[PDB]
Amino acid sequence: SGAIYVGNYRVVNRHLATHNDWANLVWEDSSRDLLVSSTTAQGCDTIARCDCQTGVYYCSSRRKHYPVSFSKPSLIFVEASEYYPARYQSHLMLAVGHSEPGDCGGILRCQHGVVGIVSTGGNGLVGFADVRDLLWLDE
Ligand SMILES: COc1ccccc1CC(=O)N1CCC[C@H](C(N)=O)C1
Numbered sequence: 001s002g003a004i005y006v007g008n009y010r011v012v013n014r015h016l017a018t019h020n021d022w023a024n025l026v027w028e029d030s031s032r033d034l035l036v037s038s039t040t041a042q043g044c045d046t047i048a049r050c051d052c053q054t055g056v057y058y059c060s061s062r063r064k065h066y067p068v069s070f071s072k073p074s075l076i077f078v079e080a081s082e083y084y085p086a087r088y089q090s091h092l093m094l095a096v097g098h099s100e101p102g103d104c105g106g107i108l109r110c111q112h113g114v115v116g117i118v119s120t121g122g123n124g125l126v127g128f129a130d131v132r133d134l135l136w137l138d139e
């Protein structure tokens with residue numbers, strides 16, 4: 001599990017979104033595995049505006065923060081989930097690191113703040129749904 005709470009937005013994995021996220025849809029993208037819903041409260045997570053490629057991600061399945069080098073946002077193939085079929089996920093960033101299904105939502109952080117959230121893994125890899133392009137979260 002895990003979300004980002006910036007201003008009046010909740011950023012979650014689309015495949016872990018709730019009835020309340022959809023009741024309050026702002027933007028979803030199946031191909032990015034991203035959904036934003038509107039909150040009544042205010043949130044003060046800082047989104048990073050950078051092209052950093054090193055960072056720290058929370059790993060719920062080890063209860064640990066792990067430093068990673070990670071790739072540039074790209075299209076990468078993703079085996080048939082229970083949530084999606086076999087497809088190219090866009091805006092994905094891979095790193096060498098432990099992940100398992102429950103670890104989706106875990107935050108990737110860099111010196112300039114929240115980079116994105118765990119979204120994929122497999123074979124000692126871990127994939128991050130980038131959120132730095134989504135300038136509209138700021139304003
Ligand atoms: C944290 O991910 C894992 C790590 C190790 C093994 C399996 C998984 C699960 C996984 O990757 N997916 C299930 C949810 C939808 C995901 C997608 N973006 O389509 C694909």
Ligand SMILES: [Zn+2]
Nearest residue numbers: 050052110112
């Ligand atoms: Zn950065």
